[PDB]
Design a protein around this ligand. Structure first.
Ligand SMILES: Cc1ccncc1NC(=O)Cc1cc(Cl)cc(-c2ccc(C)c(F)c2F)c1
Ligand SMILES: Cc1ccncc1NC(=O)Cc1cc(Cl)cc(-c2ccc(C)c(F)c2F)c1
Lengths: 304, 304
């Protein structure tokens, strides 16, 4: 028992981290097979960042200008190309530590682990969710660009995020491994609005099921609700509308605990309307939304 | 910016995890050099657990009864011995993935990462603190015994915890890598009181400094306090008494922010006496105590 914000073991990803330097800029790269992936803003100087013409900036660069180092050894760059907001540096050596991997575009509300890196060296690992507004609330400092987000299913690492920037609001923005930003963001130092965010209702309900499994049950009540009534409350409290698809995803947890999804919705409705009254749930004094139903089942079942 | 409950990258430790089976019981072992370390309760049957005579139970076992498997390959056991509550199984092969390591006994209030494992396979990693009462609030299921806690300084892994049991209260107990329990616990299925726990004051203050560094400053006030006055409030709210040693450990964070430690104590005093009034600090609605001053400096400086 016990419930923690658990990240995937980072070993398979640590073996892929490299340092990429172009001119004066050093950031992280991800070495899979004979390709190193990194944010294209590595080719920018501070002056270029206000409105960079990435095509023109990349034309001034040659393979020998991209310094790629895997720990202590230098990699030889034999090709370079830009795909959306990422640079792909072809190297003459396949990474011997390349795990089985896939590139995936995660959906908002889904979670993943981040291996925060500086100078190609891993510093720490943490779990987070892709917010409904396509930002992440991470922990990144200058030099962390190119750090990646991922999930692991058995021996396969599905890479879903590469870190590009921190907006003035302190939130983080990045791309999939094909260089497409999540959300409306651009890799340019210009004002950028992140959309209105919402709380991930299905994840809060999953976390309430995790609380029941782990013995925190004080919030269970004698009430029930309907999807329509619950959604009126979700609207008022800026929660994502619950759909039948969400109810079905919560099916396994409902079966495990014997608590109907709509009965758990009535508990969540009362918590939204009354607050916690100074009490806690799984060590938290707020409603947690960065655990998916799959995360709860995985952590509560011991999937390796 | 941003502040997360960050764990160390687990790769160096993943390379040390093995499965240990004795009779009917399977748990995790830690393979360093030519020794595999694991909880001695692996030699128990369910009936033995009420009052096991570990010396007598171990006498009925031979080297060939300890089945040690590192992933897919079987290890050959050439010696066995019990040291306190751990078994040390000498194997004929040194682990080629043995990182630079040390065995350390951590102090209460200190933090470490846990690589939760099942059947010798890593499942996830999370950060936690050794509570003042020598328990940990982890996330462990049956089969997680032998999972380890650790810290990493550069290329050296300091192992500090090995998981042994979950008490009826849902808290976790374990040993250092010499098999000595943290706290008053015994590896026996018998009633065991964990002492009165307290909140780790120096860690809460460190986390308030982390909040200021990351822009959450609403709790800063026009007040100051003394160590004596603060400690009267700490007593009332079951917080550890703050000492001059704690003030000195907070020195680097005080210098970085320009906020005197006793001024931060007055902010903490007001938060203890008034609560948060429905507000949050670094995404939390409660006062967080599982970040040490060193953790805050490390995360805020990007140490790899
Ligand atoms: C410092 C740091 C901390 C954590 N994570 C990453 C970083 N580095 C960056 O954000 C670098 C970067 C790159 C790009 Cl392409 C755009 C911007 C940027 C975007 C919008 C605004 C308005 C602005 F001021 C900006 F500087 C900034
Ligand atoms: C199931 C689980 C979940 C998370 N982590 C670990 C485990 N496994 C265990 O705790 C196994 C174990 C071993 C030892 Cl030596 C003593 C006890 C034990 C101690 C005290 C009591 C009263 C009691 F009921 C007990 F079973 C229990």
């Amino acid at each position: 028992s016990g419930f923690r914000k658990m990240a995937f073991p980072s070993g398979k990803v640590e073996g892929c981290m490299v340092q990429v330097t172009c001119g004066t800029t050093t950031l992280n790269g991800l070495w899979l097979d004979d390709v190193v992936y990194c944010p294209r803003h590595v080719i920018c100087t501070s002056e270029d960042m206000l409105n960079p013409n990435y095509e023109d900036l990349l034309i001034r660069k040659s393979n020998h200008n991209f310094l790629v180092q895997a720990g202590n050894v230098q990699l030889r760059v034999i090709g370079h190309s830009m795909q959306n907001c990422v640079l792909k540096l072809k190297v003459d050596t396949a990474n011997p530590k390349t795990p089985k991997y896939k590139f995936v575009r995660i959906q908002p509300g889904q979670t993943f682990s981040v291996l925060a890196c500086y100078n190609g060296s891993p510093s720490g690992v943490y779990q987070c969710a892709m917010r409904p507004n396509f930002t992440i609330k991470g922990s990144f400092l200058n030099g962390s660009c190119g750090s990646v987000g991922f999930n692991i299913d058995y021996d396969c690492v599905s890479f879903c995020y590469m870190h590009h920037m921190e907006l003035p609001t302190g939130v983080h923005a990045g791309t999939d491994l094909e260089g497409n930003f999540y959300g409306p963001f651009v890799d340019r130092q210009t004002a950028q609005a992140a959309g209105t965010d919402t709380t991930i209702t299905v994840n809060v309900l999953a976390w309430l099921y995790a609380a029941v499994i782990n013995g925190d049950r004080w919030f269970l009540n004698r009430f029930t609700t309907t999807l329509n009534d619950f959604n009126l409350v979700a609207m008022k409290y800026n929660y994502e509308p619950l759909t039948q698809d969400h109810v079905d995803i919560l099916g396994p947890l409902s079966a495990q605990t014997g608590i109907a999804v709509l009965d758990m919705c009535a508990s969540l409705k009362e918590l939204l309307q009354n607050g916690m009254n100074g009490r806690t749930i799984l060590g938290s004094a707020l409603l947690e939304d960065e655990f998916t139903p799959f995360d709860v089942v995985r952590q509560c079942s011991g999937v390796t």
